[PDB]
Design an enzyme around this catalytic site. Structure first.
Site, PDB file in Angstrom:
ATOM      1  N   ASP A  44     -17.492  24.401  25.702  1.00 24.91           N
ATOM      2  CA  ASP A  44     -18.878  24.196  26.129  1.00 24.91           C
ATOM      3  C   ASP A  44     -19.691  23.437  25.093  1.00 24.91           C
ATOM      4  O   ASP A  44     -19.840  23.885  23.954  1.00 24.91           O
ATOM      5  CB  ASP A  44     -19.567  25.527  26.446  1.00 24.91           C
ATOM      6  N   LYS A  78     -24.136  18.899  28.896  1.00 28.71           N
ATOM      7  CA  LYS A  78     -25.412  19.204  29.515  1.00 28.71           C
ATOM      8  C   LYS A  78     -26.448  18.111  29.281  1.00 28.71           C
ATOM      9  O   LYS A  78     -26.533  17.538  28.197  1.00 28.71           O
ATOM     10  CB  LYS A  78     -25.965  20.533  28.966  1.00 28.71           C
TER      11      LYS A  78
HETATM   12  N1  NAP Z   1     -27.185  26.841  28.537  1.00 26.91           N
HETATM   13  C1  NAP Z   1     -27.940  27.318  27.550  1.00 26.91           C
HETATM   14  O1  NAP Z   1     -29.157  27.228  27.551  1.00 26.91           O
HETATM   15  C2  NAP Z   1     -27.251  28.066  26.447  1.00 26.91           C
HETATM   16  C3  NAP Z   1     -27.980  28.931  25.654  1.00 26.91           C
HETATM   17  C4  NAP Z   1     -27.315  29.636  24.666  1.00 26.91           C
HETATM   18  C5  NAP Z   1     -25.946  29.468  24.510  1.00 26.91           C
HETATM   19  N2  NAP Z   1     -25.243  28.628  25.290  1.00 26.91           N
HETATM   20  C6  NAP Z   1     -23.787  28.449  25.097  1.00 26.91           C
HETATM   21  O2  NAP Z   1     -23.138  29.721  24.944  1.00 26.91           O
HETATM   22  C7  NAP Z   1     -22.436  29.773  23.697  1.00 26.91           C
HETATM   23  C8  NAP Z   1     -22.367  31.211  23.182  1.00 26.91           C
HETATM   24  O3  NAP Z   1     -23.678  31.754  22.981  1.00 26.91           O
HETATM   25  P1  NAP Z   1     -24.367  31.835  21.528  1.00 26.91           P
HETATM   26  O4  NAP Z   1     -23.866  30.709  20.643  1.00 26.91           O
HETATM   27  O5  NAP Z   1     -25.854  31.903  21.797  1.00 26.91           O
HETATM   28  O6  NAP Z   1     -23.950  33.263  20.917  1.00 26.91           O
HETATM   29  P2  NAP Z   1     -22.708  34.266  21.147  1.00 26.91           P
HETATM   30  O7  NAP Z   1     -21.467  33.517  21.525  1.00 26.91           O
HETATM   31  O8  NAP Z   1     -23.162  35.481  21.929  1.00 26.91           O
HETATM   32  O9  NAP Z   1     -22.533  34.763  19.625  1.00 26.91           O
HETATM   33  C9  NAP Z   1     -22.196  33.841  18.571  1.00 26.91           C
HETATM   34  C10 NAP Z   1     -22.224  34.622  17.255  1.00 26.91           C
HETATM   35  O10 NAP Z   1     -21.276  35.698  17.289  1.00 26.91           O
HETATM   36  C11 NAP Z   1     -20.422  35.645  16.137  1.00 26.91           C
HETATM   37  N3  NAP Z   1     -19.086  36.071  16.594  1.00 26.91           N
HETATM   38  C12 NAP Z   1     -18.282  35.361  17.394  1.00 26.91           C
HETATM   39  N4  NAP Z   1     -17.167  36.088  17.621  1.00 26.91           N
HETATM   40  C13 NAP Z   1     -17.289  37.262  16.959  1.00 26.91           C
HETATM   41  C14 NAP Z   1     -16.452  38.370  16.818  1.00 26.91           C
HETATM   42  N5  NAP Z   1     -15.243  38.403  17.449  1.00 26.91           N
HETATM   43  N6  NAP Z   1     -16.861  39.409  16.058  1.00 26.91           N
HETATM   44  C15 NAP Z   1     -18.053  39.371  15.442  1.00 26.91           C
HETATM   45  N7  NAP Z   1     -18.875  38.311  15.549  1.00 26.91           N
HETATM   46  C16 NAP Z   1     -18.505  37.240  16.305  1.00 26.91           C
HETATM   47  C17 NAP Z   1     -20.468  34.208  15.646  1.00 26.91           C
HETATM   48  O11 NAP Z   1     -20.252  34.124  14.228  1.00 26.91           O
HETATM   49  P3  NAP Z   1     -19.341  32.950  13.581  1.00 26.91           P
HETATM   50  O12 NAP Z   1     -19.557  31.737  14.461  1.00 26.91           O
HETATM   51  O13 NAP Z   1     -19.940  32.796  12.208  1.00 26.91           O
HETATM   52  O14 NAP Z   1     -17.925  33.481  13.624  1.00 26.91           O
HETATM   53  C18 NAP Z   1     -21.877  33.787  16.030  1.00 26.91           C
HETATM   54  O15 NAP Z   1     -22.801  34.174  14.999  1.00 26.91           O
HETATM   55  C19 NAP Z   1     -23.244  28.813  22.836  1.00 26.91           C
HETATM   56  O16 NAP Z   1     -22.590  28.423  21.629  1.00 26.91           O
HETATM   57  C20 NAP Z   1     -23.471  27.679  23.821  1.00 26.91           C
HETATM   58  O17 NAP Z   1     -22.239  26.974  23.988  1.00 26.91           O
HETATM   59  C21 NAP Z   1     -25.873  27.942  26.251  1.00 26.91           C
END
Ligand code: NAP
Ligand code: SBI
Length: 316
Positions: A44, A78
């Site tokens: 993504d 996107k």
């Molecule tokens: N469409 C939209 O508006 C929108 C909005 C938000 C997000 N998104 C997409 O969704 C993706 C995921 O959401 P997000 O980036 O907001 O947050 P998320 O995936 O809920 O969480 C990411 C965080 O969790 C940590 N993490 C990952 N795996 C872990 C594990 N197994 N144990 C402990 N900690 C862990 C990561 O640390 P490290 O990376 O330091 O390991 C990072 O700090 C985004 O990257 C983006 O691609 C889209």
């Protein structure tokens, strides 16, 4: 390696994908390489993440080294809302596709429904910090995006952060050529999205769950904010299956037939996050997790709440 959710186009979207928001330059390339080696096929991406070129480098190298074929990858990007005007849709898309070094995207999403003023700023604001709306709307943007499908540059279109009213407005658009194949929205046990998911699936639209781990690295996280990864009830269910909380949080969506895209740049976690097809949450466990809904959004974008198509004033 991930199972697939079937889109209305009959294309198969891998149910687990790698998120790339906040993944820094200098780490994201290796993250994508590690992910591909671990069996991720869905990545993504977004123009606004400002890291698509490094993602493209990783994919290109893995393809040339024959670790993966393009046909087995599922790359999503996107369109950012400052680019809703017709010539801008194409220019934004072209920069994305160039950065990613691809000849086509699997899905191109409208990133947010509310339009932003066109120009050099990604987050245009007035002298009070309020978002400035744009001239073109997401319906205008969609029409330009449909051209990309006609030309074979994008396989399918989708939406992100849309409420059911906004999906309705799209589905009802006169002369509509292509329907959205997914709605990518925040989803996790504190924001379970029951009505939105019900609505989408009833229209044959999949849901992609973002921030499934509660986005602990979002800049605006406050210590008192809900924290899924630390939730003892989640950890208790995890312990039963000898899994981590992250793995339960990811598996939760899989069992609702919802695509999920956890982000990590930590190699061990990237691998951990996809070891989710070797256990099963019981019916009782799913019901317990579902019961944790708090209607809490980590991603509210309140700065834009005054704009016509701000999505989160609607119930769902
Ligand atoms: N469409 C939209 O508006 C929108 C909005 C938000 C997000 N998104 C997409 O969704 C993706 C995921 O959401 P997000 O980036 O907001 O947050 P998320 O995936 O809920 O969480 C990411 C965080 O969790 C940590 N993490 C990952 N795996 C872990 C594990 N197994 N144990 C402990 N900690 C862990 C990561 O640390 P490290 O990376 O330091 O390991 C990072 O700090 C985004 O990257 C983006 O691609 C889209
Ligand atoms: O993956 C994301 N898509 C987004 O629109 C969001 C959520 C809201 O906050 C921001 C801010 C900057 C950014 F690049 C992105 C974001 N995170």
């Amino acid at each position: 390696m991930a199972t697939f959710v079937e889109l209305s186009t009959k294309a198969k979207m891998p149910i687990v994908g790698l998120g790339t928001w906040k993944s820094p330059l200098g780490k994201v390339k290796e993250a994508v390489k590690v992910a591909i080696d671990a069996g991720y096929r869905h990545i993504d991406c977004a123009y606004v993440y400002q890291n698509e070129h490094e993602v493209g480098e990783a994919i290109q190298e893995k393809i040339q080294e024959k670790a993966v074929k393009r046909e087995d990858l599922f790359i999503v990007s996107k369109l950012w809302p400052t680019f809703f005007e017709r010539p801008l849709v194409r220019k934004a898309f072209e920069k994305t596709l160039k950065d990613l070094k691809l000849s086509y995207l699997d899905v191109y999403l409208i990133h947010w429904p509310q339009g932003f003023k066109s120009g050099d700023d990604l987050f245009p604001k007035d002298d009070k910090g309020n978002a400035i709306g744009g001239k073109a709307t997401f319906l205008d943007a969609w029409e330009a995006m449909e051209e990309l499908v006609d030309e074979g540059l994008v396989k399918a279109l989708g939406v992100s952060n849309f409420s059911h009213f906004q999906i309705e407005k799209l589905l009802n658009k006169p002369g509509l050529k292509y329907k959205p194949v997914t709605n990518q929205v925040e989803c996790h046990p504190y924001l379970t999205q029951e009505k939105l998911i019900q609505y989408c699936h009833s229209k044959g639209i999949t849901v992609t769950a973002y921030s499934p781990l509660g986005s602990p690295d979002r800049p605006w996280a406050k210590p008192e904010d809900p924290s899924l990864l630390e939730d003892p009830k989640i950890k208790e269910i995890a312990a039963k299956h000898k899994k981590t909380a992250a793995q339960v949080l990811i598996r939760f969506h899989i069992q609702r037939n919802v695509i999920v895209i956890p982000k990590s740049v930590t190699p061990a976690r990237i691998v951990e996050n996809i070891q989710v097809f070797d256990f099963k949450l019981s019916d009782e466990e799913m019901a317990t997790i579902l019961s944790f809904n708090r209607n809490w959004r980590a991603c509210n974008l309140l700065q834009s709440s005054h704009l016509e198509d701000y999505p989160f004033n609607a119930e769902y």
